[PDB]
Scaffold this active site. Sequence first.
Site, mmCIF file in Angstrom:
data_model
loop_
_atom_site.group_PDB
_atom_site.id
_atom_site.type_symbol
_atom_site.label_atom_id
_atom_site.label_comp_id
_atom_site.label_asym_id
_atom_site.label_seq_id
_atom_site.Cartn_x
_atom_site.Cartn_y
_atom_site.Cartn_z
ATOM 1 N N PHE A 269 2.224 -12.509 6.516
ATOM 2 C CA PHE A 269 0.889 -12.816 7.003
ATOM 3 C C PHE A 269 0.190 -13.883 6.166
ATOM 4 O O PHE A 269 -0.732 -14.523 6.664
ATOM 5 C CB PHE A 269 -0.012 -11.584 6.935
ATOM 6 N N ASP B 97 3.626 0.807 8.542
ATOM 7 C CA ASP B 97 4.219 -0.055 7.530
ATOM 8 C C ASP B 97 3.832 0.407 6.131
ATOM 9 O O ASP B 97 3.454 -0.412 5.291
ATOM 10 C CB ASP B 97 3.840 -1.529 7.758
HETATM 11 C C1 LIG Z 1 -2.414 -6.765 2.800
HETATM 12 N N1 LIG Z 1 -3.608 -6.210 2.176
HETATM 13 C C2 LIG Z 1 -3.795 -5.926 0.878
HETATM 14 C C3 LIG Z 1 -5.079 -5.432 0.755
HETATM 15 C C4 LIG Z 1 -5.732 -4.986 -0.425
HETATM 16 C C5 LIG Z 1 -7.071 -4.505 -0.445
HETATM 17 C C6 LIG Z 1 -7.634 -4.129 -1.608
HETATM 18 N N2 LIG Z 1 -6.868 -4.226 -2.741
HETATM 19 N N3 LIG Z 1 -7.233 -3.867 -4.027
HETATM 20 C C7 LIG Z 1 -6.137 -4.081 -4.746
HETATM 21 C C8 LIG Z 1 -5.056 -4.564 -3.990
HETATM 22 C C9 LIG Z 1 -3.663 -4.795 -4.445
HETATM 23 C C10 LIG Z 1 -3.327 -4.665 -5.785
HETATM 24 C C11 LIG Z 1 -2.008 -4.819 -6.152
HETATM 25 N N4 LIG Z 1 -1.023 -5.093 -5.287
HETATM 26 C C12 LIG Z 1 -1.356 -5.222 -3.994
HETATM 27 C C13 LIG Z 1 -0.221 -5.509 -3.043
HETATM 28 N N5 LIG Z 1 0.918 -4.595 -3.099
HETATM 29 C C14 LIG Z 1 -2.657 -5.089 -3.531
HETATM 30 C C15 LIG Z 1 -5.576 -4.672 -2.680
HETATM 31 N N6 LIG Z 1 -4.997 -5.059 -1.537
HETATM 32 C C16 LIG Z 1 -5.585 -5.461 2.062
HETATM 33 N N7 LIG Z 1 -4.700 -5.929 2.926
HETATM 34 NA NA NA Z 2 -0.849 -18.568 4.195
#
Ligand SMILES: Cn1cc(-c2ccn3ncc(-c4ccnc(CN)c4)c3n2)cn1
Ligand code: NA
EC number: 2.7.11.1
Length: 328
Positions: A25, A179
Site C-alpha cells: 500500500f 490480515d
Molecule cells: C498499516 N498501518 C499501520 C498503522 C499504524 C497505526 C498506529 N501505529 N502506531 C505505531 C505503529 C507501528 C509501529 C511499529 N511497526 C508498525 C508496523 N508493523 C507500526 C502504527 N501503525 C496503521 N495502518
Molecule cells: Na508509496
Amino acid sequence: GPVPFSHCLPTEKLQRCEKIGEGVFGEVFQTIADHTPVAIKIIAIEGPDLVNGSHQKTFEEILPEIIISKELSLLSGEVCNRTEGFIGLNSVHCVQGSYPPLLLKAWDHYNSTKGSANDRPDFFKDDQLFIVLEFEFGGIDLEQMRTKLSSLATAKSILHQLTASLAVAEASLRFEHRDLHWGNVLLKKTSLKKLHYTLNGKSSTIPSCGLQVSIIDYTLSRLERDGIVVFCDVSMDEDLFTGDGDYQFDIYRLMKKENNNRWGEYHPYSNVLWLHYLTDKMLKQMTFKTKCNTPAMKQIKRKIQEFHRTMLNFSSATDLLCQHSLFK
Ligand SMILES: Cn1cc(-c2ccn3ncc(-c4ccnc(CN)c4)c3n2)cn1
Ligand code: NA
Ligand code: NA
Ligand code: NI
C-alpha cells in the site's frame, strides 16, 4: 480538492518523521503533532505508475479502508460494544505533491537498518495524489517484541485482548480483519492493571500484564452496517494466495477456502484463523524473559497449547471469548 503535502506535514513535523512500517500500500511514519506522537500512513492513488508491484488504487478503492478505520476508531467511545483494542483515527487528507525529501531521508534510514521490500518513493511527480491517514500512536509491533515479553502470562493477556477486540467488532460491525499478521498487532506500556471492554451490553475485564494491544492495518478488512458491506475484493488476486515460508501465507488460502472466494460475505471464522496463526507465533517463534519453569507458569503454557489445538473448532472470535476455557 487536494491540499499540498506541507498542509499535513509542515517542516517541523517532517523533520521529526521516522519510518516505522510499510506494505504494498505504501509507507508508515511516526512523528509528533501538537506535542503528541502520531503514525502517518501514506498511500499513492489515481496515478499510472507501478508502486510496490501493483497499480495504484483509485479514491473509490481506498474509501473502504477509510470507512473501516473510522468505524473501528469509534469503538473506543461506544457503550454497548466498546473496545480500545483497535487504533484511533485522527484525520484523513488527500494530498498533492512529489514525495518530500525529508520522508525519503527517513525511508533511506529504514532501508539501511531494517531493509525494505518497497520501491524508493522518489518517482512521483508534483501532481501526484496521496491519501494520508493520521492515527494514534499504538506502540511497537509484536514481531519486534518477539524476544522482549515477560512471560507466557503476557502472551495470554495479548491473546485475550485480541480475541475480545475482534469479538466486539464482530458483534457491532460483523468485522473480519483478514490480515492479522504479527506486524499488525501493536503493544504499548500501560499502568492500568485491568482493561475493560463491553460486549453486547456486558462489561468485563482483562489483566493487562502492563500492555495495551492495538490491532492495525485494515487494507483487507470487511464489515457492514445496516446491510451495506464494505470490503476489499481480492477474488481475482493471484499472488495473495501463492506465498510460502510462513503459516501467514496459508491463512490467505484457508480464508479463501472458508468463503469460497466470495469476500463480500461474512465469515468470522477468518478471525479464528488469524488468532490461530498468532497463537502459533507465540508458541514457536517467540522467547520470554521469564521461562515457564514454575508450576503456575507451566500451567499457563499448557492452557495456551490446549487453545492452539482446540480453537479451530470455534466459529468466531465471539465464540472463543464467550466459550473457550482459556478465558474462564
Ligand atoms: C498499516 N498501518 C499501520 C498503522 C499504524 C497505526 C498506529 N501505529 N502506531 C505505531 C505503529 C507501528 C509501529 C511499529 N511497526 C508498525 C508496523 N508493523 C507500526 C502504527 N501503525 C496503521 N495502518
Ligand atoms: Na508509496
Ligand atoms: Na488501541
Ligand atoms: Ni486539514
